């Protein structure tokens, strides 16, 4: 067996501020390669046409992405990391907007 | 502070970092490095591009780096994320029928259309909630 882990589940937004979003997800339930950490990627239609890697070496299944812009649409996906590399992407999260800065 | 165990003499190797704990020094490999033979005092670069590795994904050429790696696009391909590229920028060429209020994102297979927040639909059509 020399394969990466399975793809995690769709990340769920659990909390929103004007500069941060908190996400949670689960490892792939199918028996497979062991997960050693997670990678988080973010997309915004106002921030370029590629996904930006916003966190890596994430040990937990919950993490807060900070340094975001107010009143902005973000989408997120997670990859699982293992001995032989990265999983394919999880499903993309439902889009959310950060809170406004009033 | 505590005693500087690291300053007593050489301990950790070239790609390793000495840390003072309460009672002893310890060695940890630098980021992106791994023990050569089970001893974290002596580390070597992880080769993320070695055979059977899958750090880089579709339509990329893996480039190994000291402590890192990079996934370059196959010539002619356009980036989706750090790990994958795609043949065409379908979103930027009009090769899509996304709703006016749907977000277009390139994928390895083509593109997706996602209704923006507050709207419902399958991305080809979106209606306010
Ligand atoms: C979205 O719905 C329309 C009709 O409501 C349909 O013609 C189109 O194929 C659908 N697109 C997807 C991706 O399901
Ligand atoms: Ca490397």
Author numbering:
A (entry chain A): 552 to 653
B (entry chain B): 390 to 518
List passages from the publication reporting this PDB structure.
We crystallized and determined the structure of this complex at 1.8-Å resolution using molecular replacement (MR) with the NELL2–Robo3 model. NELL1 EGF2 also has a calcium ion bound at the conserved site observed for NELL2. The calcium ion is not directly located at the Robo3-binding site, but is still within 11 Å of the closest Robo3 atom. Second, our structural and biochemical analyses of the NELL1–Robo3 EGF1–3–FN1 complex demonstrate highly similar modes of receptor engagement by the EGF2 and EGF3 domains of the two NELL family members. Overall, our results indicate that NELL1 can signal through Robo3 as its receptor to induce commissural axon repulsion, albeit less effectively than NELL2.
While Robo1 and Robo2 function as classical Slit receptors, the divergent family member Robo3 does not bind Slits and instead acts as a negative regulator of Robo1/2-mediated Slit repulsion.
